[PDB]
Design a protein around this nucleic acid. Structure first.
Ligand SMILES: [Hg+2]
Ligand SMILES: [Hg+2]
Ligand SMILES: [Hg+2]
Length: 552
DNA sequence: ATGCGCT
């Protein structure tokens, strides 16, 4: 009979059904299809999981997947063998598990296949050496999902009682706020430090202009803190004899960056196009659904060999040998890139202008990544004047390399060691150290991914939740901590230190991997977790004098 | 009258 294949993304399905044609019926779950809605029955009914009854759960189809589930039902009839083709990670593994329990049937009627790429060299091997779903992987995801549930449904209520109604707490949510709160306090406590700089304009023995910066005095870094000290020094430099000590000419290079991932795309779109995280993902979504780029949600900068041959092939025909490296550039889902290098942004007349701009950003990053380095001739001049040391640095572009596709938007006169320099003028400059920069939406996302706190598909969502909840606010595209955010962050740090530690997620991931690798059992892991958590929750419930949470 | 994180 006909084989039924199920994937997560519709766009990916349409593409698979092609490189497979008829005989098979490809479809997509379009997400999860099913999820959640001493002891207290009401609390357990609300959570959908019972921590006091060996974690029995109550999953139920999403209020917006009825059709999907239904249309998937009847399709199971005219199907001989059902092939669950979701992602190999634990989330994908769980979607497969839910599909199998919602469609019913017998285990043997189900098979698990993983698609490498769209190429036929992949969609083929998919059914070649398949397998079945990994129960350990599934239970690992159930453990994560349940731990996140307990925290949110059991901590928030405590907040409603001690602080205010409508408040929330969460493994990811609360540390994102903590990051903003700490930066806020960092800025408010900052005290600018005054420092001075002195530059000197001079003439070479020829007559050419040479700008110099004072670096040392009596062999110590030159850094006056007030005008008085700056004057004492200028007085000496005005009468000093200047002579060249050393001229170090050296070839230096510039290297392209890695292709984009969700976090970096958001940051680049934010810095070069003024796009907000949510907008960037909306445009990226359009581009993906129209087949111009790969999944917009990814945490890997990897590139397939085909992708790499495709781009080198393009660089070779459009730039020449000097731009093509001897062998592929090395560096530490796939990365976000054009599905076809031969497709220019200007040819996407079916897309909004902003989507074309985003595509162009993704395209150029992808092509520059595999080109040769930029080459410069860097010159450094060392100058002596009395007890002072002065410096001048220059650079002259010799070969653009990758900057040919990704442009950004210096000539030191000829002088030899021992040459005298004629002083023209001395310019003192007052300065003040500046406080740490405020977070931007993309900037906070960057910090979250750096600590492995969120997920590509949740970063944007996180940035919004903390605002709607009233913990932080955005102004001039920059984050500011709200009083409530500080209040909640301090309470949570006081009564749930472990949960508020930035590495809580990393530590959780380790335990989840152990469950996925038969090195631990999921219910046991949840039991340990719950025991610690309840110890903290119960303590927090008490009166402030007994160590309970301070009410506002 | 109510809250999480992920696809
Ligand atoms: Hg969803
Ligand atoms: Hg690269
Ligand atoms: Hg969704």
């Amino acid at each position: 009979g006909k084989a039924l294949v199920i994937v997560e993304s519709p766009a990916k399905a349409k593409t698979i059904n092609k490189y497979l044609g008829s005989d098979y019926v490809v479809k997509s779950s379009v997400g999860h299809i099913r999820d959640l809605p001493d002891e207290r029955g009401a609390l357990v009914n609300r959570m959908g999981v019972d921590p006091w009854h060996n974690w029995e759960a109550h999953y139920e189809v999403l209020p917006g997947k009825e059709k999907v589930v239904s249309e998937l039902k009847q399709l199971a009839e005219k199907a001989d063998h059902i092939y669950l083709a979701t992602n190999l990670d634990r989330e994908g593994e769980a979607i497969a598990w839910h599909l199998r329990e919602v469609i019913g049937g017998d285990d043997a009627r189900y098979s698990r296949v993983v698609f490498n790429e769209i190429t036929k060299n992949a969609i083929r091997q998919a059914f070649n050496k398949p397998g079945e779903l990994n129960i350990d992987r599934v239970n690992a995801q159930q453990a994560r999902r349940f731990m996140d549930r307990v925290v949110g449904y059991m901590v928030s209520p405590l907040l409603w009682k001690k602080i205010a109604r409508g408040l929330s707490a969460g493994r990811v949510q609360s540390v994102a706020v903590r990051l903003v709160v700490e930066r806020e306090r960092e800025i408010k406590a900052f005290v600018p430090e005054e420092f001075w700089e002195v530059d000197a304009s001079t003439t070479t023995p020829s007559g050419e202009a040479l700008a110099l910066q004072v670096t040392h005095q009596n062999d110590k870094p030159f850094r006056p803190v007030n005008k008085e000290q700056t004057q004492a020094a200028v007085s000496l430099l005005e009468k000093a004899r200047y002579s060249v000590l050393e001229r170090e000419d050296k070839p230096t290079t510039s290297k392209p960056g890695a292709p984009f991932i969700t976090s970096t795309l958001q940051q680049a779109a934010s810095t070069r196009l003024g796009f907000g995280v949510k907008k960037t993902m909306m445009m990226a979504q359009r581009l993906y659904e129209a087949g111009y780029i790969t999944y917009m949600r990814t945490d890997s900068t990897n590139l397939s060999q085909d992708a790499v041959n495709m781009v080198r092939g393009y660089i070779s025909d459009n730039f020449g040998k000097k731009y093509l490296p001897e062998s592929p550039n090395q560096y530490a889902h796939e990365a976000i890139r054009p599905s076809d290098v031969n497709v220019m942004a200007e040819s996407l007349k079916d897309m909004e202008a902003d989507a074309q701009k985003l595509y162009q950003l993704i395209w150029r990053q992808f092509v520059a990544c595999q080109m040769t380095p930029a080459k410069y001739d860097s010159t450094t001049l060392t100058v002596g004047a009395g007890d002072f040391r002065l410096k001048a640095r220059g650079r002259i572009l010799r070969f653009d390399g990758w900057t040919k596709v990704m442009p950004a938007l210096r000539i030191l006169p000829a002088v030899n060691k021992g040459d005298a320099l004629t002083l023209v003028e001395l310019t003192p400059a007052q300065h003040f150290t500046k406080p740490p920069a405020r977070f931007s939406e993309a900037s906070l996302v960057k910090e979250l991914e750096k600590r492995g706190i969120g997920r590509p598909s949740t970063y944007a969502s996180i940035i919004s939740t903390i605002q709607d909840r009233g913990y932080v606010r955005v102004e001039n595209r920059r984050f500011y901590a709200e009083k409530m955010g500080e209040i909640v962050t301090d309470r949570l740090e006081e009564n749930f230190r472990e949960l508020m530690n930035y590495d809580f997620t990393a530590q959780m991931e380790n335990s989840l991997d152990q469950v996925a690798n038969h090195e631990a059992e999921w219910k046991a892991v949840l039991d340990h977790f719950f025991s610690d958590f309840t110890q903290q929750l119960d303590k927090a419930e008490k009166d402030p004098e007994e160590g309970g949470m301070r009410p506002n």
